[PDB]
Structures are given as structure tokens and as C-alpha cells.
RNA sequence: AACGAGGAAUUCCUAGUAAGCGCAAGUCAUCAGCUUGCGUUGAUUACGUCCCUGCCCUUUGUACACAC
């Protein structure tokens, strides 16, 4: 067998996380899948990647998709990059040592926000569920967990060490206390959720769902109801859409990023900047107090609208700097694996330019959209073909690209070995041939088809070509020297989705729009055979290198291996729980790699049809697959722009109360003799006392008082076990238990909580142990029972006076209503019949 | 009145009856009482409470009877010694 | 019998959860861990009946 | 598996006494010139004196001293 | 030559029982290298406990009161 492991992943420039910025012409750290990407803004190419030695398919990764780096945050003092992953695990990365050192996990969901301060060296994490967990990097223990939200965490701010402010994915905002571990105030923000939170020390800004921000002011007011956090202003006009992340920097500008390609920048002002504006508003109020209340209902006092920034791809992450307080520079990561650098000049008054400057762009190494098809040359030269038109030429030994072109709505690509030319298939009915040494648009045949083409293949010579389309046609093409021409077009019954030419150059299989695979003789077009029984249109057709067996699979998640000689089958194998997309063959052995929509690439054998290897490189869809013609490395093209290349290699009741009785009363007799010490110390002479005998560490860890710690063991003993575990206690502990009740009687609050339980327990011990308790002479026992009988009777009479008052008091309330509201009846036998009908009736099961 | 609806719920069991009996006594001693004489309309609901209290009155008075076993224990020990 | 002139039942309004032991929950104050516990308590009780 | 001394029921004291005195007769006249009638008279008379030469008295103080070694 | 009441390790057994003793029959299966009945003699030691090893049940009291 073999063990193939992935070498690297490419086109992973910007994943779904917030980036961070490094000073120096700055540097930028973005997110990758199971990695993070770090480069220069100036050059753009990678300088390092942060991962351990874990490839999927090896002993490290198991049967699950890898954790996407869904958040990262870096501090420039310790050079620690705290990354949040998709399964709630928390990793921290040394930048110079490129190694993870601590690996916590406390969340069951993906980590949304991370904010960590090196001033106390603490790490605060926020996930997609409610829990905010604060770790410390010096003790590696989850110190205090903040759990009061209901939906999620999306806002985040830590203010030293007494408060914490967070917003959830339902429109409500919390403030907690450090010391008291609980919340203080909650306040709803919007009807929908409040995504973004940016904080300056005076104002808190929170966006909503319908292009609405709320400007809130914090205070250190100790009032119970209000004044902790107020809601004076609402500003509008971001877009029609709403923001997700808001961030602010000083010399006094802040920005909000939407989901509709729109970053909006607004300027906040200060005291005299708004106080002169207040006089300007007072000049507006003069031109009763209608305008003054309209100046209190307002947002031009703080929010000065600077400008908006319109991108073309969906804006994902943004962090921004400023240089010399005149040029604010904004870094952007798009939906695609592309980086935008936006620089805006200002003189603290004017936007100074209509559009932001694109001084730095990273586009030449990503994928820019979803990649659709792959090409592998004979000497390991890769090509990638995407949807919007990025045909990129990659080399494995560099792990980089050479150049990229523009090629329309391209779908498929086949590589001609002769001259190293690339045949390209667009969704438009046209063909393209692109060269390496010369230019690209030499001879691109327009109007070759009407509808969308879906499959291309070629002969082993390369001079003959086939184009399968949804025009219910397949067209044969030949190259005459320097242009392609059509040779033979066959109409068919349905749309054609997958075409493969045989490596023996004798067969040409066609996947129709039905569940039919019809294979023709390549020499003659003579309708050799048809296959049927897939229940869905077939997406991938393969035949072996020696041309004995056909391997096909459709969207109904099964591989139905056929026989090329007779049209029989060998194995119908269900796998790949979403839908099977593509099948590729090893060029020397009967082995087929299946890539599918559920992010799994499986390697099977053609002689046992069991899973020999299972690959879990990523989590999104796998669009195409490719296998090298001589070596055997497998290239997988993903939906999230990933190119993975796989190079091959005890106690009992009664006893529990006894230890409770022995521990507490030795502590009780400990404090009793100590109380007699200070009565003999600080009264007569001086006398250096015992200086507080220490309580037990078992007592002080839970911090239960010794009367209480004995007491709840009585509740923990069950009701039928108590009568038999109370006679296992001998008379020496009986004298202790009488001393225990005489000490818990001094706290009347503790007695009345479980007074009938104490009454049942005490008057069973003394009832059973009566002969020893009476015929043992002790003045202390005479005093202790005298204290406990007079106090238990007084406590029982106190709770019996309340019961008997409520019985007699509310019987009066009943009988007063029964003469006031009740209209009584004179007719005695008719009244007693009516009361029997008006009385309560209940049904019970009986036996006659 | 809504507290008295919740007070009837707490009186149903035999552990929370001390809180339930204190709250009804709070209505008739600690509150504004002549105002509470004025207001009708709840008196059907308050009548469903009372035979639970008479069970709890008879149980507690039986516990007073079991508390005089100590009075026998103190007298007989004093007589013997 | 006094338990037959009132046997305590389930809550008259969906925002509360009454129980047989006389105590009563309310939905909008309960923690999600305890609400999941009371979900599991009512699930195995209804599976018994 | 430590030995722990426990006290003994009066019925068990009778049952162990009769079992040890009979075996003391049977083991003494195992292969000897004396028969069972002679040695049971020798075992019972020595047991009544507590003269520590019968098998039954020799097990009485041995089982106690084993129990006396760890109370 | 083996053999002086039988090693480790295992199995069974609570009263007309274990154990010992003879007599009779040979029942459409099974049994003569034995099987099945019928009598005589007739004990020790638990008859409690869930501590260990197992095996099962229960964890809304719903079967009507009281108690809990």
C-alpha cells in the first residue's frame, strides 16, 4: 500500500478571520486553513507559515474536518499570536519560534472574538455560544468564566480588571464585574442583533441590522437602575446593509465595515470641537426649545461623516493604521483570497481625495474565485482554472505561480503535452488555447457551441480533441498547422456532462443527462454499449489504463464500477454522504480517488473495493481532482480555494455522619475552649492565649460552618436509611450529637430551616438510647437538655402559633363570605339538596 | 393576591409550609390590614388552602408531644440523681 | 382528603412550569442548563406514560 | 488481608467447643494403641482442668492470642 | 516397578439432607463395563448478609385514606 500526505496548501491568502498588522512598509498576518499567512505589504509573497507537522491522512488527523482559523490576535510585546479555531480550541503562537506552546479548549463552538492584554498576561476568549472564558498564559487555568448571554458573542471590550462589555447575536449588551463574577446591567440595542462594538473611553458605538448605530456612554455611577450606560444618540446611513466590525484609532477617526462591499469612515470630535459646534447648534437653535430637543435627538455633535469606500468583493476583515496623522491606511481582506490596501489622505478636515488609493494589492497568488478544474503536466507542472477567468500556472517545486490570464467563464481545462499548450473550456460556447512562451490569445475559437459545455478530453497524441456540451452534441476537433478545426459532430438525445477518451485511444464514454453512460468506439462512432442504473445524471466517468473496467459515479453518492468488455459490473459502492463529484485513476495500479461535496477524498483499491486511505484536507466542497501521470501525487481543488498536493511515501450511612460528628464537634469544642481562654485572658490579667486554633482544611475549603457541615450530611442520608443508621451510633457520639443540637440551637435561622428533621432525628436517638442517657449522672447533660428542650418547645410553639392562627383566621374569611356573597335559601331540604350539588365531587376507581 | 396564589402552591408540600404560613400571617399582621379587609374577589381561592394547614397543624402539634419525652428524660434523671 | 380537594397540577400558563412537589419554575428566568435538565425530566416522564 | 479480632456468639462458643473436643479424640487415636473411648476421656478430663495438654484447650488460648495480637 | 488416605486448581451440598449399608426390578427411549427403584443407619454447619463476585429491578407513589 501507500501513505500519502499533503505537502502544502495554496491560494489560502485570506480565510474567514480578522487580520492583524505588524509595523516596521508594514507587514500583515492573515488566516489560512490550519495555518496563518504572514507576509510583507510591499512584496506580498509569504515569509513563513505557522503549523506543526500534522498532515491529514497521517497518524495526527482523524475522521473530521480540520479546524478553520476563525480568529487571530497578536500582541507586539511578547510576539504572541493567539488563534481561535473552529472547535473551540485555543492556541498561542510564538512569532520567532513559529511554534504553538499552549493548547486549551473550553468552548464547544467556534471562537468569535479574542482580546488579550499582556499587562496582566491574560487571555479572554469569546465563542459562538454564550461563554466568555478568561485564561492566563502564566497559570494555564481557566480563571473565571462569564456565562450570562443567550445567543453568541460578537462585541468585546475589556477595561482593565473590573468590567467587561460584550454583545451577543441577539440585540442585547452586557456588563459584568470581575470580583462579583456576575452581571450588573443588561440593555437591548436593536430589534435584531448588534454585531460590532468599538469603544473609546467616552463613547461606545454599536451597529445593528438596518444600517443603524447606537452611540452609548459608559459611567462609573453606582446607581442601581440607570446611569451606568445610556443611549442618547442614533446615527444612520451606512448603506442599506449593516455593519459587522467597528474599530477606532486616534491622531480621531473610526470605520464601520458592512457586508455589501462598503467600508464607511466617520470622524469623532472632542470637547471644543463639539462645543464650538454646540454654539453653532445654538445658532441653529436660535434660528421655544424645539430645536434644542432636536439637538438632543444630535449625531452631528460627535459623528462627522468622512467618506465611504466601495470594494468589489465581499469585505471580510479590516484593520487599519495611520502615519504622521495625515494619511490613514486601511488593510482589507476580501471574500476571495485577495488583499486590498487603502490609503486616504487628510488634514483633519477634508477627505482630500474622492477614492482611496490602491497602493498595494495582493491578487497574483490567490484564486480570486472558486477553482473549477486542474491540469498536471508530464514533468509536474500544475495549472488551475477558476470561474471568473483566473487561469494560473503553478509549479510544485516552487509552490508558487508563474503568471495568470483572463479567460471568461471558464469551466474545464486539458493540457496538451506537445508545445505545452492549454486547451480551455468556457461556459460560453467557445474554445481557447493558451501558450506558455508566447502570449495567450493566439487562436481562441468563438461560437463553438450554443449552450454551456461541461467536458473536454483529448487523445494521447493530442492532435484530436473532443468537446462535450449541454447542446446535446459532442464535437471532434483536429489541429492543423496553426488553428483548430471541427471534424465530426454527433448529435445525441440528452445533454452531455462527462467525456473521457480511453488511454488505449479506442473508447469514448459519454454521460448523458439521464442516468446513462454510453461508451463509443473512438475509431468508428459505432454505439458500442450503454450503461444504466444510476438514478441521477453521471458526473464522472473513468476507465482503467489497460481498458478493462469502467468506473463511474453520479450525484446519488455511489460508485458503480462497470466492465468495459461486456458491460457488466463488479461493485456498487455507496460513499461520500453528500454527492460524488469526480473520480481519478492511478496510472499504474487499479486505484481510484473519489472527491466529493462533503470534503472527503477517499482512496480505494480496484481489487478489494475497501477504503485504503481517507483524506480530510479541508471542510468546503471539492470541485475537481487530478492525478499525476507517472508519479502518483493527487491534486485536489477546493471550494475555499485550496490546492492540496498529496506526495506518497466507600463509606456507609451512619459512618458518614460519624465522621461529620467527630469533625465538627472537635471544631466546636476547639472554639469553646478558645472562648473560655479569652474569657480568662482579656478580663483578669493578660494571659497569652492559644491564638485561634485552626479550623480544618476540609471545613475551610468549602467554607461551611461546623454546625452547617454536620447538618447537610443528615439531609444527604436518605429517609429509609436514617432510621437504621441512627442506631449504629454509640452513646459516646450520642453525647456529641446532643452537644451538636445545642450549638445549632444558638443559630435560630439554622434550626427552623429543617426543624421537623431535627425533631425526628433527636427524638429517635433519645427514645432509643433512653436507658443510658437517663442513668448516667452529669450536671452538664442536665443543663444541655434543659437548654434544648426549652428552646425546641419555644421554636415549635412559634411555628404552631402561626399555623393555628392561619387555620382560625382564614376559616373566618370563608364563613364571612358564605354569609355575605352567598344568597342563602330558606327551604331547608331544598337548600341541603343544592349544597350537595354545589359541593366538591371526585371520581375513584372501585370494585363491586 | 397573586402572591397568595403562589402561597397556595408552597403550602401543598410539607417543607415550604413555614414560608407559606408566615406569608399569610404577614398579610394579616405585617401589611396594611384594614385595606386587606376592604378588598373582595379572592375569597374562593383562599378557601382551597386551609385543610393543608390543618394537616400541618396536627403534624407540628404531634412534634410538640414528642418534645415532652425530654421532659420525662430530665425528670427521671433528676429523680434518680 | 385535602390532596383531593387540590391535587397540584401542571402550570396554567406556558411561561411557568409547575411540579408535583409544589415548587414552580418560570421560563424566562431559568438557566439553559437547568432548562435542558427540566426538558430531560419531562421527556423521561412522558416516555414512562 | 489483615486479621481482625471479633467477639463470638455463645452458640458459636458451644459449637466450637464440641467440634474441637471430638476431633481431639479422633486425632489422638488416629494410629495408636488407644481407642476412641480412652482418648475422649483423656481429652475431656484435661479440658475440665484447663491443664493445657488437650488439643481443645491448646486451641482455646491459641485462637485467643491470635485475636489478642491485633485487637 | 506402582502403592501407607492423595497437590496445586476446581466442583457439589442445608434435614429424614450429605454420607454409609444392603435388597429388588431391568418397563417401546437409555441402561448390563450399568441403570432405575425400595428399605436400614443417619449427622456437622449456615438458616444471616449484601462487605466481595455475579444476576436482575427501580429512579413521576399514582394503586383512594393516614403517615412519610
From Swiss-Prot, chain B:
Transmembrane segments: none
Cell location: Nucleus, Nucleolus
Miscellaneous note of the record: Present with 8070 molecules/cell in log phase SD medium.
Role, per record: Involved in nucleolar processing of pre-18S ribosomal RNA.
Assembly: Interacts with snoRNA U3. Interacts with MPP10. Component of the ribosomal small subunit (SSU) processome composed of at least 40 protein subunits and snoRNA U3.
Protein name: U3 small nucleolar RNA-associated protein 13
Organism of this sequence: Saccharomyces cerevisiae (strain ATCC 204508 / S288c)
Gene: UTP13
Residues of the full protein shown: 737 to 817 of 817
From Swiss-Prot, chain C:
Subcellular location: Nucleus, Nucleolus
Family: Belongs to the MPP10 family.
Function of the molecule: Involved in nucleolar processing of pre-18S ribosomal RNA. Required for the early cleavages at sites A0, A1 and A2 during 18S ribosomal pre-RNA processing.
Assembly and oligomerization: Component of a heterotrimeric complex containing IMP3, IMP4 and MPP10. Interacts with snoRNA U3. Component of the ribosomal small subunit (SSU) processome composed of at least 40 protein subunits and snoRNA U3. Interacts with the SSU processome subunits EMG1, IMP3, IMP4, KRR1, NOC4/UTP19, NOP1, RPS4A, RPS4B, RPS6A, RPS6B, RPS7A, RPS7B, RPS9A, RPS9B, RPS14A, RPS14B, UTP1-UTP18, UTP20-UTP22 and UTP25.
Stated name of the protein: U3 small nucleolar RNA-associated protein MPP10
UniProtKB/Swiss-Prot annotation, chain D:
Post-translational modification (record): N-terminally acetylated by acetyltransferase NatA.
Compartment list: Cytoplasm
Reported function: Component of the ribosome, a large ribonucleoprotein complex responsible for the synthesis of proteins in the cell. The small ribosomal subunit (SSU) binds messenger RNAs (mRNAs) and translates the encoded message by selecting cognate aminoacyl-transfer RNA (tRNA) molecules. The large subunit (LSU) contains the ribosomal catalytic site termed the peptidyl transferase center (PTC), which catalyzes the formation of peptide bonds, thereby polymerizing the amino acids delivered by tRNAs into a polypeptide chain.
Location in chain, cross-link Glycyl lysine isopeptide (Lys-Gly) (interchain with G-Cter in ubiquitin): 49
Segments passing through the bilayer: none
The protein, known as: Small ribosomal subunit protein uS7
Subunit comment: Component of the small ribosomal subunit (SSU). Mature yeast ribosomes consist of a small (40S) and a large (60S) subunit. The 40S small subunit contains 1 molecule of ribosomal RNA (18S rRNA) and 33 different proteins (encoded by 57 genes). The large 60S subunit contains 3 rRNA molecules (25S, 5.8S and 5S rRNA) and 46 different proteins (encoded by 81 genes).
Domain of life of the organism encoding this protein: Eukaryota
Similarity remark: Belongs to the universal ribosomal protein uS7 family.
Amino acid at each position: 500500500y501507500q501513505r500519502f500526505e499533503q505537502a502544502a496548501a495554496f491560494g489560502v491568502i485570506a480565510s474567514n478571520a480578522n487580520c492583524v498588522w505588524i509595523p516596521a512598509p508594514g507587514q500583515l498576518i492573515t488566516s489560512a486553513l490550519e495555518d496563518v499567512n504572514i507576509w510583507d505589504i510591499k512584496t506580498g509573497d509569504l515569509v513563513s507559515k505557522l503549523s506543526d507537522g500534522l498532515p491529514p491522512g497521517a497518524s495526527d488527523a482523524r475522521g473530521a474536518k480540520p479546524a478553520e482559523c476563525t480568529y487571530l490576535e497578536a500582541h507586539k510585546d511578547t510576539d504572541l499570536l493567539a488563534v481561535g479555531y473552529a472547535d473551540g480550541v485555543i492556541k498561542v503562537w510564538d512569532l520567532m519560534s513559529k511554534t504553538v506552546l499552549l493548547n486549551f479548549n473550553g468552548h464547544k463552538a467556534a471562537i468569535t472574538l479574542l482580546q488579550f492584554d499582556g499587562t496582566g498576561t491574560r487571555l479572554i476568549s469569546g465563542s459562538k455560544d454564550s461563554n466568555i472564558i478568561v485564561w492566563d498564559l502564566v497559570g494555564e487555568v481557566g480563571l473565571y468564566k462569564l456565562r450570562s448571554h443567550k445567543d453568541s458573542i460578537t462585541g468585546f471590550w475589556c477595561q482593565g480588571e473590573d468590567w467587561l462589555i460584550s454583545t451577543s447575536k441577539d440585540g442585547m449588551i452586557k456588563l459584568w464585574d470581575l470580583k462579583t463574577h456576575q452581571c450588573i446591567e443588561t440593555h437591548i440595542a436593536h430589534t435584531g442583533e448588534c454585531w460590532g462594538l468599538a469603544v473609546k473611553d467616552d463613547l461606545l458605538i454599536t451597529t445593528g441590522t438596518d444600517s443603524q448605530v447606537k452611540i452609548w456612554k459608559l459611567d462609573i455611577e453606582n446607581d442601581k437602575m440607570g446611569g451606568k450606560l445610556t443611549e442618547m444618540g442614533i446615527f444612520e446611513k451606512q448603506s442599506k446593509q449593516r455593519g459587522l466590525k467597528i474599530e477606532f484609532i486616534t491622531n480621531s477617526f473610526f470605520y464601520i465595515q458592512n457586508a455589501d462591499k462598503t467600508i464607511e469612515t466617520f470622524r469623532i470630535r472632542x470637547x471644543x470641537x463639539x462645543x464650538x459646534x454646540x454654539x453653532x447648534x445654538x445658532x441653529x437653535x436660535x434660528x421655544x426649545x424645539x430645536x434644542x430637543x432636536x439637538x438632543x435627538x444630535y449625531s452631528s455633535f460627535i459623528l462627522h461623516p468622512f467618506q465611504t469606500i466601495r470594494s468589489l468583493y465581499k469585505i471580510k476583515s479590516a484593520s487599519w493604521t495611520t502615519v504622521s496623522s495625515s494619511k490613514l491606511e486601511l488593510v482589507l481582506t476580501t471574500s476571495s483570497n485577495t488583499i486590498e490596501y487603502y490609503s486616504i489622505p487628510y488634514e483633519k478636515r477634508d477627505p482630500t481625495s474622492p477614492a482611496p488609493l490602491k497602493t498595494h494589492t495582493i491578487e497574483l497568488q490567490g484564486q480570486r474565485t472558486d477553482v473549477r478544474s486542474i491540469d498536471i503536466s508530464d514533468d509536474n507542472k500544475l495549472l488551475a482554472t477558476a470561474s471568473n477567468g483566473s487561469l494560473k500556472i503553478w509549479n510544485i517545486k516552487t509552490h508558487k505561480c508563474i503568471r495568470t490570464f483572463e479567460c471568461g467563464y471558464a469551466l474545464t481545462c486539458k493540457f496538451l503535452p506537445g508545445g505545452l499548450l492549454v486547451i480551455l473550456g468556457t461556459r460560453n460556447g467557445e474554445l481557447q488555447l493558451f501558450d506558455l512562451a508566447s502570449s495567450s490569445l493566439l487562436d481562441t475559437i468563438e461560437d463553438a457551441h450554443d449552450a454551456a459545455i461541461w467536458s473536454l478530453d483529448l487523445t494521447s497524441d493530442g492532435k484530436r480533441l473532443v468537446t462535450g456540451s449541454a447542446d446535446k452534441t459532442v464535437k471532434f476537433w483536429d489541429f492543423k498547422v496553426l488553428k483548430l478545426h471541427h471534424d465530426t459532430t454527433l448529435e445525441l438525445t440528452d445533454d452531455i456532462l462527462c467525456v473521457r477518451v480511453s488511454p488505449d485511444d479506442r473508447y469514448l464514454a459519454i454521460s448523458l443527462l439521464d442516468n446513462t453512460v454510453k461508451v463509443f468506439f473512438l475509431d468508428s462512432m459505432k454505439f458500442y454499449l450503454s450503461l444504466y442504473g444510476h438514478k441521477l445524471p453521471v458526473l464522472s466517468i473513468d476507465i482503467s489504463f489497460d481498458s478493462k473496467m469502467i468506473i463511474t459515479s453520479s450525484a446519488d453518492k455511489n460508485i458503480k464500477i462497470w466492465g468495459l468488455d461486456f458491460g457488466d459490473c463488479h461493485k456498487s459502492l455507496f460513499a461520500h454522504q453528500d454527492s460524488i463529484m469526480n473520480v481519478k485513476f492511478l496510472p499504474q495500479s487499479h486505484n481510484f480517488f473519489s472527491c466529493s461535496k462533503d470534503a472527503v477524498v477517499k482512496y480505494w483499491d480496484g481489487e478489494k473495493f475497501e477504503c485504503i486511505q481517507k483524506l480530510y484536507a479541508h471542510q468546503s466542497e471539492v470541485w475537481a481532482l487530478a492525478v499525476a501521470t507517472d508519479g502518483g501525487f493527487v491534486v485536489s481543488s477546493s471550494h475555499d480555494h485550496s490546492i492540496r498536493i498529496w506526495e506518497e511515501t466507600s463509606l456507609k450511612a451512619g459512618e458518614r455522619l460519624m465522621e461529620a460528628l467527630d469533625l465538627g464537634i472537635a471544631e466546636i469544642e476547639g472554639l469553646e475552649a478558645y472562648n473560655r481562654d479569652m474569657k480568662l485572658x482579656x478580663x483578669x490579667x493578660x494571659x497569652x492565649x492559644x491564638x485561634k486554633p485552626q479550623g480544618n482544611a476540609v471545613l475551610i475549603a468549602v467554607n461551611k460552618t461546623p454546625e452547617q457541615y454536620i447538618m447537610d450530611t443528615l439531609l444527604r442520608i436518605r429517609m429509609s436509611q436514617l432510621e437504621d443508621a441512627l442506631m449504629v451510633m454509640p452513646f459516646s457520639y450520642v453525647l456529641k450529637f446532643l452537644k451538636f443540637i445545642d450549638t445549632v440551637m444558638q443559630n435560630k435561622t439554622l434550626l427552623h430551616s429543617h426543624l421537623p428533621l431535627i425533631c425526628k432525628n433527636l427524638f429517635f436517638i433519645i427514645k432509643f438510647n433512653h436507658k443510658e442517657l437517663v442513668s448516667q449522672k452529669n450536671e452538664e447533660l442536665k443543663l444541655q437538655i434543659n437548654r434544648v428542650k426549652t428552646e425546641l418547645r419555644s421554636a415549635l410553639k412559634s411555628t404552631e402559633d402561626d399555623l393555628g392562627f392561619n387555620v382560625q383566621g382564614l376559616k373566618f374569611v370563608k364563613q364571612q363570605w358564605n354569609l355575605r356573597h352567598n344568597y342563602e335559601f330558606v327551604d331547608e331540604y331544598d337548600q341541603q339538596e343544592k349544597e350537595s350539588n354545589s359541593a366538591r365531587k371526585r371520581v375513584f376507581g372501585t370494585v363491586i | 393576591i397573586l402572591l397568595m396564589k403562589r402561597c397556595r402552591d408552597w403550602n401543598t408540600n410539607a417543607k415550604t409550609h413555614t414560608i407559606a404560613q408566615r406569608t399569610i400571617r404577614c398579610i394579616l399582621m405585617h401589611h396594611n390590614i384594614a385595606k386587606l379587609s376592604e378588598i373582595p374577589g379572592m375569597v374562593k381561592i383562599v378557601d382551597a388552602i386551609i385543610p393543608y394547614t390543618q394537616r400541618h397543624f396536627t403534624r407540628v402539634d404531634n412534634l410538640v408531644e414528642q418534645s415532652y419525652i425530654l421532659d420525662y428524660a430530665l425528670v427521671e434523671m433528676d429523680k434518680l440523681f | 382528603a385535602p390532596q383531593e380537594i387540590y391535587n397540584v397540577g401542571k402550570a396554567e400558563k406556558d411561561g411557568e412550569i409547575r411540579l408535583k412537589n409544589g415548587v414552580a419554575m418560570s421560563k424566562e428566568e431559568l438557566t439553559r442548563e437547568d432548562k435542558n435538565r427540566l426538558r430531560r425530566a419531562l421527556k423521561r416522564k412522558r416516555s414512562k406514560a | 488481608a489483615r486479621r481482625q479480632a471479633v467477639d463470638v456468639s455463645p452458640l458459636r462458643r458451644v459449637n466450637q467447643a464440641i467440634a474441637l473436643l471430638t476431633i481431639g479424640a479422633r486425632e489422638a487415636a488416629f494410629r495408636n494403641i488407644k481407642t476412641i473411648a480412652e482418648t475422649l476421656a483423656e481429652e475431656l478430663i484435661n479440658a475440665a482442668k484447663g491443664s493445657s495438654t488437650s488439643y481443645a484447650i491448646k486451641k482455646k488460648d491459641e485462637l485467643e492470642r491470635v485475636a489478642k495480637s491485633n485487637r
